[PDB]
Each structure stands twice: as C-alpha cells, then as structure tokens.
C-alpha cells in the first residue's frame, strides 16, 4: 500500500504564547505556538499585525525568548517533543523575511525515564544557560557560551526524583534554580545554585512541607526577588527569611493552571483557571501582602500573555483564542474583562461527518469541536469567499451592467438592472444607492446590454431597439429598429461594435459619433441562442451558438462567414458563449442549459478552435462573464454552483465560489465599492470584494456544552448530536447550554459534579436546536448512527449507551435505543437492554451491527418494529472500534489489537479472517479498502495493516509520524490518487489520506529526497527524523508527506531545476521544472 498524507487545515489550537523583542529591539512581538506552526506578530495599538509564519519539523514543546549579552535583539529558544533544540533568529534581508538557525542539536539521552510532569525548559535571567528537566533524576544544562553552535550540554544528577515545576530566580550572586518536588514524606520546595565551572549543583539560598497539592512556581523579578507558589487552596510567597501566605475564598473552586507577569516590576500577575476564571494577583508594597482580584471570564486558557495597553492574549486549546481588554479597579465599576477579538480554534475535533449540504456535489465537514462551554459545531466549507459590503432586496433581476454616467470621472457611478419588460437605473454615491432615471435610456423595455461606448457615449440595447445616448447633455442621438418591428432576441456589444440577432437572422452595427450604421446582414441555419464579440480596437470576429444544430461557431469580421463550426451534442441549447484570453493564450468557452461547459483554444487570425474538453458545473443554465482579479482576467460562471475560472500554467482551473446560486454578475468599480463585484440572484443584489485564491471557511455554532458524536439524517434535513453538559449537585446547570435551550424537549422514560447526556437534533440550514432528548440518570451515551433497517422505510437515529456507576468498573448493562424524528419531537421507537456498554454501532447491509463489551452482535429489524438478534461473536479483545466494508468487519480495541471478522450469509454466523496484536495505544481506525486498514497510534503516528493457509496475520505496510492525535477518520472529500479519508485531530488540524499507484509512490518518494536536499528546515531538523515512527524509532514507510511535496511550488525557479536534475519521468526522459509544477498543482486539487 502506497499512501499520501496532506494537511487540509493546519492545527489551530494554541499551546504557547510568549512576548518579547524578536523582529526588532524597537518592536513588541507576540509569538504563538500551534503545535508545529510558529506565528509571529507585531503588537500595535490597532491590534496584532501578522509578520511571519513558519512550520517546523517538530512539535513545539518549549518556546522562550532570551537576549544574551551583546545582541541587538531577542533570540528564540525552541525545543521539540523529539528533543530537537534550536536557537533561532529573525532575519529581514530586503523585502524578504527568514528565520535563521544560530544553533541546533538533539538534547536526548539514550537511557532516560521521561518525567511525569513533562518537559520543562527554562533560561536564567543573565542568559548564561538553559535548563531542561527532561528525565527523572537529571537536570540538563546547555551553557550559552556564544561559540556553542552545536548546543553541546551536560547533565547534573538531582536527588529528587519527582520534581513538579521549576524556575530560575532573579537577583543572585550566581545562577540559582527553585523547585517544588515530592518524596514519600510530602511536597517541599528547595533551591540549588548552578556552576558551569564545576558542572555540578552547589546547595542554595533557602528551602521549605508546603501545601499538599502545590503545582506552579513563579520567579519574582529583581525589585523584590523570591518565588510565588500556587496550589489548590494556597498562594505562598517565599524568600531568604521573608514569607507570606494566603488562601482567599475566590480561587478554591477550580485549580490555577497558567500565569503571566503583567509588568517588569513584578507588581501584578495574571492567573488562569481550568474553567475560564482570569484573576489578577497583586504584590502589595516593601512586600506587605498579596491581594487577588477576579477580573472576569475568558476562553479556557492554556496560556496567557499580557500585551500592553491593557490587552491580553488568551491562548486556548479547548475553544477559540482571544484578545481581551482589562480595566483598572475603576471608580464606577470593579475591574472587568471585555472580548476584543476572537480567533477560530477547531480542535479538539472529537468527531465529524461530511455532508453535501448545498446539494451541489461539494462535501462540507461538520465537526464536534471544543469542550465544556467552548463546545461547538463547526461547518467547514471549501471555496472562494465573497466579502459582502452591501445588499439590496430586488427580485427578478435579469441583467447587470456597470456604467460611467460622468465622462471625466474614472470610475463607475451607475448600475443598470433589467427585469422582465422593464429597465431600472441605480446611481451610486459612495455607499448610498438610489434608483433614478437616466435620460435617453428607456425604462418600459427589457435591456439586453448597456454601457459606455466609443466617442463619449452610452448605448442601451432593448428588445425593442438599440438606443444610443450622449455622455454630455444626455439625450437620444440615434436609434436602430428592426425593419418589420420584430424584437431583438439576443444582443452583444463592445467598445465600438454591436451585433444583435433577431430570431434566426442577425445584423451587425458599428458605433460612430452620433450615428449607429448598419454594416452587415445574414441568415442562420437554426434560431440564434447566444453571441460574443470581445476584443483580444475592434474585434475581427464574432462567436455564435445556435438552437437546433446545438452548435458553437465562429464568424468573420463583417461578412459573417463560418470559420470553425463545432457540434456540441445532445438535445439542450447553448445559454452563453465567451471568447476570452487566459494566461497569454486565447480560448472560447461555451455553456449549455444542463450545466455543461465546453472550452476550446482559440486562434484570433484564422479562427481555429482546438482541443475540446468538457466539464459539468451545476445543472441549471450557466451565464459566463469576464472580470479582473489582480492585473489579470478571470471568468465568473453564474449558475446553481457558481464558479471562477482562472488559468494556472496553461491548463484551466475551476475554483468553485462559496455562495448559493448567482444568476447574473458584473464587475463594479465605484468610489465606495472599488475593485468590486455586483452579484444578483432571484431575490437579491449583493455588492462585494472577492478573495484571490481558494481557502477553507468556518461557520461556528456555539453549544456551550460538550458535543461528542454527530451524524446527519438527510430525510429529516437535520443532524443528530450526542452532547454532554456538567451539572453540580443540589442537580443544577452552571450555564444555559444547547440541551437546555431547545425548542421542543424530553426525558427518557425508564426501563459535586455530574455529567448529563443528551441527543440534540439540530437544523441543517439554521443550526437551531430543535429538540433535546435527555438519557437516564447514570446513562452514558456512547454511539450514534442514522439509518434505515430491514423492510422499514422510516429512518431512525439509533444510540448505544452504557450504565456507569462509580462502584462499577466494567459496565454490566446498557441500551440500544431506536428513535424517530417525525413531529418537532423525538419518539422512542424501541429499547433493547443489553448486558454491557455499546461502544460502537454501524448499519450493516440493512441490519444493525453493534459492539457490546467484548461481543460483536448483529440485530435484524422486525415488522413488529423490534430488534432481534441474528448472531454473536465473542472476542478476546474489547470491541471499541467497528468499521465495515460490504460483508467485511473490522474490530479494534484501545491497545491496537485489530481483528477482521466476516459475515457469512450461508452460515448464519461470523468467521475470523485475520488478526494482528501489537501493544500500543490506538485512537482511531478506518477501512481504506477490502485489503488495507488505516490506523492512528501512540506518539502521534499513523500506521497501515494490509491483509495479504496461515495468512490470517496482517502485514504492517505503513508507518508515519503525523505529529497530530487523530480522533476520527471518515471517508469523504471537500472538492467537486485513489480514495479520500479525512481525519480530525485534537489540535484542530484536519488531514486527508489518499492512495497512490506504485509508480507514483516511487516518483514522489525520490522527489521527497530531492526536496529535502533543497529546502531550509527551521531548527535544522531532518525531515526523515521528524516523520520517523516514534515512541522503538523506525523510518517512515508507505506514506508520502504531501505537505513536503506541495512545498515544491514555493521554492525558487532554480531550486526546482536542481530538484528535477536528471529525474526519470513517464510519458521515460529528462524532466523539466514545468513538468513537475503541473503535477504538484494536480495534487493540490484533492483538498
């Protein structure tokens, strides 16, 4: 098996946030860590200015800014989870930005038990050294002698094997570290000093049984000195002979988990609760006492950073991050917190599903995201977005035209709108739209075109006539009518050249001052459908599409004589046709009423249409329309599924536009709406800017409780969501939540903190909670599915459950509840008591498969409307995971034991096919196909078992360090390689897995290696080290880092040429840069 993994969506969860002077000494920076990503901003009055963002080949585990003696600005120390240490510097060389690596080395020890309080990394305030507590019984020291470019470092044995937190202190004759530890007597604080000179600890200034549950340590700066120690109940200062202590009522509620220093003084600190409380702690003065104020509520903070001007960065892992404003203990109101800005954080993605929501043939991902109030559904859609600036209700718009009403202003001030038998004119002044008359333009006739034309004039082309109007002193200066007064049926005009068409006939007029002169006439072999006349001054040809021969055609400049004449096929007519110019070539596009779009290369001199390709874009008819997007032209295909059409290296691309149907559009360049679009649909005119390239767009739906599983019932037009709110014993809520705020509501009729489970029913379009069904007291909802069973036509939400009692370890009882959502409410259609926890379920060939502890059990759905067992299968593992393909069944436990059962219809029971037991923690599994099984496993790895007598063992074909923790896999794709499996992750990264042909695998593997020679890596970390399956540590196999491959496009033109130097390539021969460019761009369009 040959797989390709790529990032659809980088991790969003913040796990570190530091400030300092990194970019310049004169700039204040905020650095943010999002697992493998490092964002760098500059703090402003206006907010946060982004500056440089980079990935690492590493999970950022330590991130500290420091300034060693005689350096203009701060340097950044980072240590990864694989013990990659680096010192980094910000390098602006001209108009480009780069993060250069001053030093790097791997600080790992061969023999070492990693500490239970994780990696801790600290730098002394003189910047003599870096301390790393990596392992129990050891303290690693990296001296900061400027010659130490390899980060060579020594260890010192600690006596104390269970260290909790540790800092370096301020104001000491020598570098001194302070730390809480635990031995079988109790929890105490100690200090040592650190001599590089001796590579050893000397005993230090002071010591202390401190609070049972003391956890945090804070180095106080030099105005006082000393250390603050936070616990559950206490906050204790310590120093030589000085000592304070408090236990305010306000924090005994939830534990403090993050802190931050507000001023260099050390007067104030920000404290971070585990549930969102944000406190100040003030050091009152010398050092008299400690006051603690409760400032307000934030998102549940992983880290905090005071930014100055009373603004605070709140980094979160469980919900959105924030900038919040603080207020001083003001004369009128107590010090309080206000949310200034929110940044999206998808993770943790705990479950998701893919839904074709818009009906467009475009998947949308809907995730269960967040926890404990930060809980949320997130709707993730792929596309080009429209930034909307104005909206106008006007139904029945048939056409849009921008127009310059004042000839010595360089900018549109008019929008003209056609309706059935009716024309209307909107004038624009800044952002004020007013319908008005345009003298000379008729209003009781349907316009087919208007706009500016040569010799300082406006033209309007009605069904009745072709009016022509003076820019100055507007009035009619010309009119052209059809000989026997017949209606103009199709119209097309440019700068200086009209080509109307009447029924089967078509005339060709030209625009000259105060006169429109008839030049040609002609007939046509069937009725005329659509015209174009675009210059590529005056255009020497004219495109046509016709009604019966269903055919696109080119014509001559005045004669109207056929130049190419291609038959398009089928029974549906042309709807629009467009001669356009992409890249530096010329094309002809033509659209059918059924949604089909055919494109041809064009030859302006001869007329030769070449290389027909087809594509289908949204089944309603399609109007094509030219616009400018950054010094180049695109095409906007107004339809069911609106679409922009650009050309990336001489092959066209169809980025879809992120809107419900657009019928007509035109570009608009006003003073109030510069470089904009005007879109109309059946009910509304919209005015907006447009994004250049595609992106992922995230709609958020707050639940204010934990969502846990989700599935979609298309017939009901709604989502099932298992959720979980926390009440406290009386039992009452802590806040209003999705389940307590539902329209309709219910509770299951029967057979200190508490969890209460519900099945929410949420509207597909509006995401209103329509109903909230509460399960029993002590009942824990585990699994959810929405399916049809047996001969029954009705569709049901089915939930598996378990009965959790604190006395009981392994649950002895549970339920399989079948529900129907039919009225606004939810009917319990059937229970089924079961002697165990229902961990999983799956619709299985019209029957219900379901794990109950170690048993896999198949149920049929009776006409009596009850669940009846067919067969069973007792395992020697616990069936946590259940996935199927056809009659094949995949079972897994938490410990990476996997089975492969098969149903046998002729035999009535299940049979074992294959198995693999290999002890490791498994978080998710998926069936890639009948033979291959994708899984996620401990230390952020992906792995692939393959199927292929004593061949019921499963071969290990795939290994890869992802760097993310996968909760859910699910088959689907967010676009309109073989297969697509999306996965969601704890940091809110989303990834895609697909499969490759061996040929392609081999090519791309070579190319990774060529790439790794050429691409600068931040901590100088080898890509191979990074992707190595790690816990054992082995090279990755049968997995292509698509992120690596995609980075090819970002390298300079010569680095490409270097990468492809003597690369054998199929069609083999010596390959080009442009050969691989168009391959890699084909690979970007799977996600």
């Amino acid at each position: 098996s040959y797989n390709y993994v790529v990032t659809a969506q980088k991790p969003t969860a913040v796990n570190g946030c530091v400030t300092g002077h990194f970019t310049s000494a004169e700039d204040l920076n905020l650095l943010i860590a999002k697992n493998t990503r490092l964002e760098i901003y500059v703090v402003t009055a206006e907010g946060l200015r982004p500056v440089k963002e980079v990935g690492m080949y590493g999970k950022i585990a330590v991130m500290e800014l420091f300034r060693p003696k005689g350096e203009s600005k701060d340097l950044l120390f980072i240590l990864t989870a694989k013990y990659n240490a680096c010192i980094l510097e910000y390098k602006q060389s001209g108009e480009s930005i780069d993060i250069i690596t001053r030093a790097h080395g791997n600080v790992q020890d061969r023999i070492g038990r990693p500490s239970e309080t994780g990696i801790i990394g600290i730098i002394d305030p003189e910047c003599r050294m870096i301390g790393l507590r990596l392992y129990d019984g050891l303290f690693k020291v990296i001296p900061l002698d400027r010659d130490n470019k390899e980060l060579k470092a020594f260890n010192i044995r600690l006596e104390e094997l269970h260290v909790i937190d540790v800092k370096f202190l301020y104001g000491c004759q020598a570098p001194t570290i302070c730390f809480v530890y635990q031995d079988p007597q109790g929890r105490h604080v100690k200090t040592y000093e650190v001599s590089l000179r001796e590579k050893e600890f000397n005993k230090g200034p002071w010591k202390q049984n401190v609070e049972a549950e003391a956890s945090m340590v804070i180095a106080v700066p030099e105005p006082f000195g000393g250390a603050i120690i936070i616990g559950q109940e206490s906050i204790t200062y310590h120093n030589g002979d000085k000592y304070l202590a408090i236990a305010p009522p306000i924090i005994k509620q939830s534990t403090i988990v993050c802190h931050n220093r507000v001023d260099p003084n050390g007067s104030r600190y920000l404290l971070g609760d585990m549930e969102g409380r944000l406190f100040m702690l003030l050091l009152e003065k010398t050092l008299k006492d400690l006051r603690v104020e409760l400032l307000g509520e934030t998102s549940i903070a992983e880290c905090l950073t005071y930014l100055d001007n009373g603004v605070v960065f709140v980094g979160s892992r469980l919900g959105d991050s924030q900038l919040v404003k603080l207020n001083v203990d003001s004369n009128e109101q107590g010090s309080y917190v206000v949310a200034m800005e929110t940044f999206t954080n998808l993770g943790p993605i705990v479950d998701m599903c893919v839904v074709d929501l818009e009906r467009q043939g475009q998947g949308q991902l809907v995730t269960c995201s967040g926890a404990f109030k930060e809980g949320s559904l997130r709707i993730i859609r792929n596309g080009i977005g429209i930034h909307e600036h104005a909206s106008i209700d006007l139904p029945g718009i048939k056409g849009l035209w921008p127009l310059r009403s004042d000839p010595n202003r360089e900018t549109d001030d008019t929008l003209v709108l056609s309706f059935v038998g009716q024309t209307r004119v909107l004038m624009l002044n800044g952002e004020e739209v007013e319908e008005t008359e345009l003298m000379g333009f008729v209003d009781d006739q349907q316009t087919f075109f208007c706009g500016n034309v040569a010799h300082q004039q406006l033209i309007q082309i009605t069904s009745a006539s072709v009016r022509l109007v003076s820019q100055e002193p507007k009035a009619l200066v010309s009119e052209w009518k059809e000989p026997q007064a017949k209606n103009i049926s199709v119209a097309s005009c440019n700068s200086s050249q009209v080509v109307v068409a009447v029924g089967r006939a078509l005339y060709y007029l030209q625009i000259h001052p105060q006169e429109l002169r008839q030049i040609s006439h002609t007939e046509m072999e069937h009725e005329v459908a659509c015209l174009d006349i675009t210059p590529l001054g005056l255009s020497p040809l004219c495109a046509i599409g016709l009604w019966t021969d269903i055919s696109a055609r080119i014509l001559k400049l005045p004669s109207f004589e056929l130049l190419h004449k291609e038959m398009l096929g089928g029974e549906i007519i042309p709807r629009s046709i467009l001669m356009t110019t992409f890249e530096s070539s010329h094309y002809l596009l033509c659209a059918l009423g059924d949604g089909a779009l055919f494109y041809f290369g064009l030859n302006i001199e001869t007329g030769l249409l070449s290389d027909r390709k087809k594509v289908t874009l949204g089944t309603q008819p399609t109007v094509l329309r030219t616009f400018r997007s950054l010094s180049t032209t695109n095409v906007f295909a107004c339809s069911d599924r609106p679409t922009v059409i650009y050309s990336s290296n001489h092959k066209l691309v169809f980025s879809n536009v992120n809107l419900k149907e657009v019928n007509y559009m035109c570009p608009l360049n006003s003073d109030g709406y510069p470089d904009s679009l005007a879109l109309a649909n059946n009910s509304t005119l919209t005015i907006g800017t447009i994004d250049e390239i595609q992106k992922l767009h995230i709609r958020t739906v707050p639940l204010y409780e934990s969502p846990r599983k989700i599935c979609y019932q298309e017939v009901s037009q709604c989502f099932g969501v298992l959720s979980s709110r926390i009440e406290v014993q009386d039992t009452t809520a802590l806040r209003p939540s999705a389940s307590t705020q539902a329209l309709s509501s219910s509770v299951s009729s029967s057979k200190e903190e508490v969890e209460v489970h519900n099945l929410l029913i949420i509207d597909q379009h509006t995401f209103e909670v329509l109903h909230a069904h509460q399960f029993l007291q002590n009942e824990y909802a585990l699994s959810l599915v929405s399916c049809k069973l047996g001969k029954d036509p009705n569709t049901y939400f089915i939930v598996g459950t378990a009965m959790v009692y604190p006395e009981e370890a392994e649950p002895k009882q549970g339920r399989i509840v079948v529900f129907q959502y039919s009225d606004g409410k939810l009917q319990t259609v059937a229970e089924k008591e079961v002697k165990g926890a229902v961990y999983s379920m799956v619709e299985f060939n019209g029957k219900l498969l379901a794990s109950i502890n170690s048993t896999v059990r198949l149920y049929e759905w009776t006409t009596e409307k009850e669940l009846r067992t067919e067969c069973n299968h007792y395992n020697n593992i616990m069936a946590l995971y259940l996935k199927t393909k056809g009659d094949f069944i995949l079972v897994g436990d938490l410990m990476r034991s996997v089975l492969l059962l098969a149903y046998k219809p002729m035999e009535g029971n299940f049979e074992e096919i294959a198995r693999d037991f290999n002890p490791n923690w498994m978080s998710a599994v998926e069936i890639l196909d009948d033979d291959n099984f994708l899984g996620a496993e401990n230390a952020f790895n992906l792995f692939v078992c393959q199927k292929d007598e004593e061949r019921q063992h499963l071969q290990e074909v795939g290994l890869f360090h992802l760097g993310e923790f996968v909760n859910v896999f699910c088959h689907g794709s967010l676009v309109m390689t073989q297969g697509s499996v999306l996965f969601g992750t704890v940091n809110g990264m989303i990834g895609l897995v697909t499969s490759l042909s061996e040929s392609w695998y081999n090519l791309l593997l070579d190319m990774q290696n060529r790439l790794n020679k050429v691409i600068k890596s931040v901590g100088k970390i080898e890509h191979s080290f990074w992707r190595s399956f790690h816990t054992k540590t082995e090279p990755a196999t049968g997995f292509i880092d698509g992120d690596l491959i995609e980075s090819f496009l970002d390298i300079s033109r010569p680095k490409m040429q270097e990468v492809v130097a003597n690369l054998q390539y199929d069609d083999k021969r010596e390959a080009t840069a442009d050969d691989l460019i168009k391959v890699v761009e084909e690979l970007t369009r799977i996600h």
Partner: protein, 363 residues
C-alpha cells in the same frame, strides 16, 4: 489463621543450611545466551516464581555444581520447544547422606526467552541458545494527549472516593479524545492492580510489587490454570493486557475439576486461600524431585483419602499430609493437610496439585 505464612516459601523440608547467592543476573534485552537445560523437569516457569529442586542423576549433579561456579542461570523450557523462562539458582545444598548423591537447589525464574538452537551435549544435557525477550512497557494512555498546563497536576498525594478523584484528575484529558475517563481507567495499570488486589485481599493483607510487570507475573503464578493458558499469559508481553487477562480469569473461572474425568467438582474460588506469602498456589518438590504446584483451599469434595497421615517431607511444617484422589477416576488430585498440634489454625485444609485440576466457567 495463625500459621507462619513465610515457613512455606523457605522450603525447610529440603534442609535449612544451604549456601545462598545474592540474586541479580539479568541478561540484556534481545541478547543471545547459551544456557543449560534441566532435564526431567516439565513446567511453565513464570518470572519471579520460586522453583525448588532435587537432582540425583550425576550429570544433573555435575552441571548444577558447574553452574554454581559460573552465572547460576538455567533454561526451563515450556514444551511443544519454542519459548521458555530463565531460572537463577539462589540456594545450593550438597548431600551424601544415606551413602547416596543428592543436590538440592532453589531457583527463581527471571527472564522469558525464545529458543533458537538446542545442541544436546555428549554428557546428556541439552544446551539452549536463547533470545532474551524484552518486557514491553507503554506510557500512560493520557501521556500523548495531555494538556501541558495540566502537566503540573499529574503527581498526587497518595477510600473509594479517592479513586473517583484519581479517575477525574488523571483522565481529565479524555475529553480531547473520543472516549470517557471510565474507559481509559480500564487500561490503567494502577487501577487494574488495585482491582486484582481486592480478590487477593479476600484470599489474604500484605505488600506486593509496585511494578506492573512484576505484579502481573506474581499474580500469574497464583492462578490455577492449565498449561495452555499459562502460555497465553506468558506470550502477552504488555503488562496491562496481562493484568486485564488475569482479572478476567479471576472473575469468570469459579469451579475447579478433575482434569481426567472432566466432570467431578473438586472445589470453588470461594475456598481458595493463602498460606504462602507467595500466594494461594506455589511450586514444591517432593522427595523424588517431582515438582508440584499446589493450590491451598479450605474445602474440597469428591476426594478419597488413602494411606495414613504423615509429616514426612511435609511442605507445610506443622501439618501432616494424606494422599487425596478423584472419587470417580482415581487420579491423584493432591493432599489433605491436617494439624499436628491442637491449637493451630486452620486445623485442616487441602493442597491440590495444579496439573490434576481444570478451571471451568459454569452452565
């Protein structure tokens, strides 16, 4: 109960003046070793398990005597072989009384292995080249997923309400995953060891190994199970899977029967109890050098007692033994033990030999 529960584990019936050796020899993981093989001994030795021996044939007497000079470990093969366990000699006794040669050792199983080669020497003794199997250790289920702000709270102060606060504290980050705290608790060494300790507390009050591996191998030896499951347990490399598998065996398996007849209920789980510090079951050698793993229970049924009580060579000093056989098929199931002094408690009990038994789940 007031019988000295350490008297059994010292095997005084061998004689109590043996030269001792400070037990410590551990071969490297995945290394290869050439170790001799005890002939004439068929058992599945578990790491940590004490194994007493009596050897007569002068080839056996030789190569032990040699082993005392050089490394003291030997191979104890688990038969149809592929897998076994090393055993280190920690006590030696030469004896030429009654005219005849005897060697008495006390070994202790140490490391599991895979067999590679088995060249049998011209002396008559097999010499097994041997791959030392590593002892699979995994981190906490939470270690990967864990919030770094919540690292600081992972160590706790050391009572069923305590286990709930433990479960809430330890597995809080289960909310990031797609499962509950109560599921992660079912794969938690410490929770699993405590649960096993409760079936151990009703057999009976002590201190046992902190280490999940050591604990798991200790409780493996208490289980009266057939030779084939013993091997299932041994092959399981992960201690967590071993502890869960042991919990299962302990809950499900509740009767014990005569292996030969297949339907004669000798005793129940309710009756199992511990007179050895080792546990309710342990290996003892008889006078002829046959090793018996003997599970002590309070009551037994359908046994016939033949011969008369004897204290000769008794494995439990103070008690005399009477041979017990299956009422139906005559199979030597074990021995009834009976007090010699009238104040000892308990007064009587049955010691039933593992090989003759067969654990069952009812219905």
């Amino acid at each position: 109960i007031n019988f000295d529960t350490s008297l059994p584990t010292s095997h005084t019936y061998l004689g109590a003046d043996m030269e001792e050796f400070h037990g410590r020899t551990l071969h490297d993981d995945d290394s290869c070793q050439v170790i001799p093989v005890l002939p004439q001994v068929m058992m599945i030795l578990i790491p940590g398990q004490t194994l007493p021996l009596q050897l007569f044939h002068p080839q056996e007497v030789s190569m032990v005597r040699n082993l005392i000079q050089k490394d003291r470990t030997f191979a104890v093969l688990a038969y149809s072989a592929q897998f076994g366990t090393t055993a280190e000699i920690y006590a030696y006794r030469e004896e030429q009384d009654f005219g005849i040669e005897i060697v008495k050792v006390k070994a202790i199983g140490r490391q599991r292995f895979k067999v590679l080669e088995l060249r049998t020497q011209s002396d008559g003794i097999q010499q097994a080249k041997v791959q030392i199997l590593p002892e699979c250790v995994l981190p906490s289920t939470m270690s990967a997923v864990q919030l770094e702000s919540l690292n600081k709270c992972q160590i706790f102060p050391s009572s069923y309400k305590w286990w709930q606060k433990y479960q809430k504290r330890k597995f809080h980050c289960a909310n990031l995953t797609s499962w509950p705290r109560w599921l992660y608790s079912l794969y938690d060494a410490e929770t699993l060891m405590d649960r096993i300790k409760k079936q151990l507390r009703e057999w009976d009050d002590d201190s046992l190994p902190s280490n999940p591996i050591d604990f798991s191998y200790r409780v493996a030896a208490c289980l009266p199970i057939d030779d084939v499951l013993r091997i299932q347990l041994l092959k399981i490399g992960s201690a967590i899977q071993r502890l869960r598998c042991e919990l299962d065996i302990m809950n499900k398996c509740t009767s014990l029967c005569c292996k030969q007849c297949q339907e004669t209920e000798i005793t129940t789980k309710n009756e199992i109890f511990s007179l050895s510090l080792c546990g309710p079951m342990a290996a003892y050698v008889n006078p002829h050098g046959y090793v018996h793993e003997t599970l002590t229970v309070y009551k037994a049924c359908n046994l016939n007692l033949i011969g008369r009580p004897s204290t000769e060579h008794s494995w439990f000093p103070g008690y005399a033994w009477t041979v017990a056989q299956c009422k139906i098929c005559a199979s030597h199931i074990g021995w009834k033990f009976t007090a010699t002094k009238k104040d000892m408690s308990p007064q009587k009990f049955w010691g039933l030999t593992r090989s003759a038994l067969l654990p069952t789940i009812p219905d």
